[PDB]
């Protein structure tokens, strides 16, 4: 069987998101690093087992793929599509490589980020660097429990990993990233009941609102999609809070994994463009996307054999 990267890691309490572009002539340096990134993950992580829980997921963008590799492309790989809604906009920003680094502690993430960027100095330009921290009770920046309905076990594998539909790339996945900044002052002006109507779940107990009370423009209602087969379309989301109190920056870094980008893209269309029953996702009245990129995260064996 093809070995996937650690896409299906549990939630961790810390993360570093690194997005870079590949400079002209940086291709060979990048390929050498990609062939070593699993050995660097083991080097930093092994000595901190079993509590460290260090992993790195490496993704490659559409344009970068054509510069790095000859032969077949993954079927679903394309640049992130800008969404220009009546009120809210999902921007497309540059990114050739994603490093999604997770651990129980920020220092382990930083040590791996240092070894990776050390090997890439002179070959890449940093576009985004976010140090994420989950709150102690699994809450996000908005004060809600975050990750509850993520798939687990066999359902997660089926939702997230490329299989027989694209056999040369089996065990890969597609990652969409968006960095969101929140209007915390406007959010904290809402009553708890009004915040629950925005999300679609109870704030303290994390119980879903019943179908009779859940607004059609609630985050949970708009991101609930059924496929051709009547089954739920599922993604794995590993949202991380980040920020700077001095700059009044209060963010959620969104990363969503899926077997095809079509699922994530359908959810984004419903959020930003709306439906017959909803102008847009009410979460967007308190959240502005300032980045947007799509990456293919190949099977671990594809990176090793390069």
């Amino acid at each position: 069987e093809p070995e996937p990267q650690m896409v299906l890691s549990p939630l961790t309490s810390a993360a570093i998101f690194l997005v870079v572009t590949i400079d002209s002539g940086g291709e060979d340096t990048v390929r050498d690093l990609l062939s070593d990134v699993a050995s660097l993950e083991r080097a930093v992580g092994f000595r901190a087992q079993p509590d460290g829980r260090l992993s790195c997921v490496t993704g490659i963008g559409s344009e970068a793929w054509d510069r790095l590799f000859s032969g077949a492309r993954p079927a679903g790989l394309h640049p992130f599509r800008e969404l220009d809604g009546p009120v809210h906009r999902a921007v497309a920003t540059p990114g050739d490589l994603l490093f999604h680094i997770r651990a129980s502690r920020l220092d382990l993430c930083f040590a791996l980020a240092t070894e990776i960027m050390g090997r890439l100095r002179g070959a890449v330009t940093p576009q985004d660097e976010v140090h994420g921290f989950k709150y102690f009770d699994e809450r996000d920046m908005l004060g809600f429990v975050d990750g509850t309905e993520n798939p687990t076990g066999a359902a997660a594998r089926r939702a997230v990993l490329v299989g027989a539909e694209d056999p040369a790339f089996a065990g890969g996945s597609y990652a969409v990233v968006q960095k969101y900044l929140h209007d915390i002052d406007a959010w904290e002006g809402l009553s708890v009941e009004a915040q629950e109507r925005v999300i679609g779940r109870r704030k303290m107990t994390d119980v879903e609102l019943s179908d009779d009370v859940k607004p059609a423009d609630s985050h949970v209602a708009l991101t609930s999609v059924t496929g051709p087969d009547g089954s739920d379309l599922e993604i794995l989301a590993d949202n991380m809070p980040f920020g700077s109190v001095g700059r009044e920056e209060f963010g959620t870094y969104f990363i969503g994994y899926a077997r095809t980008p079509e699922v994530t893209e359908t959810m984004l269309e419903r959020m930003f463009l709306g439906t017959a029953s909803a102008p847009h996702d009410r979460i967007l009245d308190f959240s502005t996307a300032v980045t947007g990129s799509l990456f293919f995260t190949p099977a671990a064996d594809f990176l090793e054999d390069l």
Copy 2:
């Protein structure tokens, strides 16, 4: 008098916040100071016993005169710039220090958010650092950091104001300096050459014997004896910080002492040197870009405003 949590254990995460008080900000600051222990309990209590959240609040010399009438702490003055032959210890603005520590960065951030929320419109941020200790108690240079800090009774005697300034008993003095490292130059040294810079073995943290420890090693220069033959001691809670994209690899220094004269004597030896040492060799790999001195009063002084 109850001291603030100056004598906290080691924590793996910290936020350092330094702000200046804007024109007319005094009343807003006084209200927050009277509430900061209650905000620390509000954020921290629900995460006990693993959170280990604490906040130490410090006030600078100029800010003291704007906020309070009556007696000043005897040792409170602005940070003294040291302009050495090679290396310089700079002075930068700061009226208020918040030294926030916990087992996890999210608890530090949640307390920092409530504090800055109450101070919006009254202060200007000067510095914000999110610190993380390495899982083996190492700093950015790869050395174990904090080994010779005093503990128990020796720590109380070294750090807390007593009968020499009785109105301020239970207070302390904090010196902060943000350092940026030349990691490329440091990593070009052999481990043996790095051990000669610090004065300790890198892997095992055993002190070099007096016959091998260079006179210009960090441990040799920061070892000071008082007139009475006693070691002069401070409590240092150094925290790594950085940004890989910006190639920023730092150590945030904070040193607590019963009088600033001890910390200032250590800085003079590091920056100006001795008869036997031009300067602290750690400064050939470390540049100070901030410098501020604060008085951290007893907790009941802040509560009684």
Copy 3:
């Protein structure tokens, strides 16, 4: 087919809830059954991954006919009362079982609260027990409890319905009995006499050799071999409970098996005895005050 969490890791806290469905409560019950996996995730997620919260939902024989049309699980029937020469296994009412386990009682209680909140006006509570682990995985008799439970593939084979009843594959059968102990009489036995009752060493939990193990020891009577010479196995997740003021020192027994015939053969040996054993000596110190049988369907059955 996805089973419920019948094969849960060891947990230190449990709530057992047994209710009857009132006349006209059927639709309220069906709506809750379709939601119970969502409620388990809602309560459990905020304590992940150390919470280990799970709920196993079971349905009784009589309740099954009131709730559903079409096929019944092949083994589902009311608990059979056993009237032995000395000891009796009583049958008591129960339409729904909630077997709630976690590493802490708060998670169990919060899930029990949401479930009973949805069922208010539709059900009558029959039994509620709050169980706790007692130091060294010990029970109220001071013996290690759970040692010989099957694990891995052997556990799946022993506990889950397969191809013998294909519409119900991934289901299981749960037998529950609440036991109260005579701790005064038990503590009057020497340790060596207690070891002869159970069939294992008290401190070290080593099985007694075949030459010394009495025929009427608990371990000898509950050891049954099937047609092929293989041991017939169940998964037992016994939990201590009690009230010191009322002198109630209990074991809540729950036994999971792929067919109730295995568990029922063990109960017959214990209560009725054999040619070699009058009855299980554990029953001279333990009185059953409840007895019910439930089918715990595959998770996908409850969702649709």
Copy 4:
């Protein structure tokens, strides 16, 4: 003098046992009191260092007179019933309190078993509650509970008898009340209306500012200043308990203080009200079904008995 473990580290489980001493049970009770520290060590030592087992033993006013022939603690009297215009604080029988705490209920239960085993035939049980920590130190109303308890030196000064009653130095006074909550009525309030009852924010546990905090909020009525302008403080170790089938959702209140006058002044404000407040709004959702006062002597007083 060595105090009992009144100032215990944080624990997640408790058993509260209240018994009366039967006629002729005095000798059996005295023998047990002289042994209760040895029983605590016997059950607890084998589970060190994580068990954190302690037992605090309290004696009521009437029981004190039956057991001991010398001086009484200055503040010991039967619990004073408070008959308010709306709410009543009942006085119920209790001679002995066992306040048993640990990191796990098994240790509490095993110690309760050994104590009651020694007292069979000499006492009648009045009350038995098994308490548990609920999430992030919340009580059954969904609020964080314990936040403003004193710590360290301030706790010692607030809770332990000193030079004002020198024969009893190291002792304390415990008031117990078992409360049952009307959860249906409580859950009909908005979160903002709940916060006005308590005096703190529900999710974040931030105290309401003095300009918004109602005069009849729990935090406003239990905030008392003494003759010198200093705050009068108690140590409260509230524990949730209940039974979902019987719809019993409770708070077991125990308050420790150096003199019962502090706790009694707080109860008078709650139940009888002030010029500005009819009564504590928490009592519109909470009914006291027990009320007892106990003196918890220094450990060496119990050890030195016949």
Copy 5:
């Protein structure tokens, strides 16, 4: 279908290695014990689950196999082959039975070793007993991280467990044991850079030296072997530090598991006999093997069906 023993154990911090010979006439006692060893593992281990992580792996030597069992032998079972190199020697020492006992705590290991040796008294003679302990961040006595490049998951199963090539013994494995004593005085006279050239990795950070700088006689270069298909040949090594400061004994207990002994034997030949480019493994200039034995560790159900 065949259940392997716990060859692929999670990470554990304590171990006992017991090697015994079977005395003349001890065969029947040994067969009875082998049929009971999984029941003894459950008896000691269950009460400490789930954090105890107690397991025992039982191995049988080539000569003992012929004394105990009639019928088929595992295809790869033979006595350990002595290697007489120009400088360094890998000695063969007697051993009929291996007990590889691991747990999170030494007490569980010791209690299981006690029950096993209790059943075997008068049937076996102990040859070697070592109590191993985890040393800081997974370091060995040379101060290097040890275990980094072990296979995990499916790759570990494929490398370690017998499959269809020897179908009667599927789910078995081969264990090679060597007890090594280190010359710590000579090792600590090397600079860290000279130590890194011996191992082939950075000491503090555990990053592999690049192919241009890694010496051909480094430990990592000599133990890196490719098979006929260009794939790396892998083993599972679970090295444990041990020692006695008073006797200046600073040791590594090596145990290597593989699906066939030919892989481990090829690594030993390269270390002891060298290649065209390396006289021998430089680690052997600081490490002396004082035992050497090979065992077959059968599937669990082979032992149970005695």
Copy 6:
């Protein structure tokens, strides 16, 4: 004002006991190490803070004291007194220096023992080295809970630390060490009830037997001593299990700390020589002492000022 060594350490799960003799001419090397032992303890221990709990207590024997130091001697310092009972003997064996090393993990103990013995090579000869481990719920090799009745807090300080009776040595303590080997075959031939009569406590529950059933020759009855003024004479005992399954060696390493050796020596006299009511301690019918040494453990500041 004098700082004691960590005689009153929290509970630890691992220990190394090192006893050495000082070779002719080794005095100066020993004095240098004594002045550095607190610095070595911090160097090894800091990197594992705060859960490591590493401490070293250094003791000096009577003969060694006279070789190392001039002037006043601790008032109670003498060689261990051999006890020649009618049946049982307490042997005196050589030992000049004791290192009593404790931590939550063996690796910290071992690393500190290595640094100490490294500094002492050529100046000392090892006499005894034992690696101790916690055995289940604080049990010893006889299956009984061990340490239950040790004093704690202020009572422990008063029992263990030299004060005004020997003011030049205030803050010191006296340690008696005896290595015991158990006859486990003889012990396992007793019923549990017969074992309980040997110890004087219940085996599973660790409840003391009542005064009406506790035999006069039980361990608990013989080690219970009152002084002329009615107060209990107390020691701090920190017994550690050790052993080797292959050698059938099952031991208890006894170390007892007291403010004067007269207390410990009175307990040993009652055990070995007996009383009017008891021939000897019945624990000695299953336990043989194979070492016996007495050391003075000075105040930390005494060692630092060399």
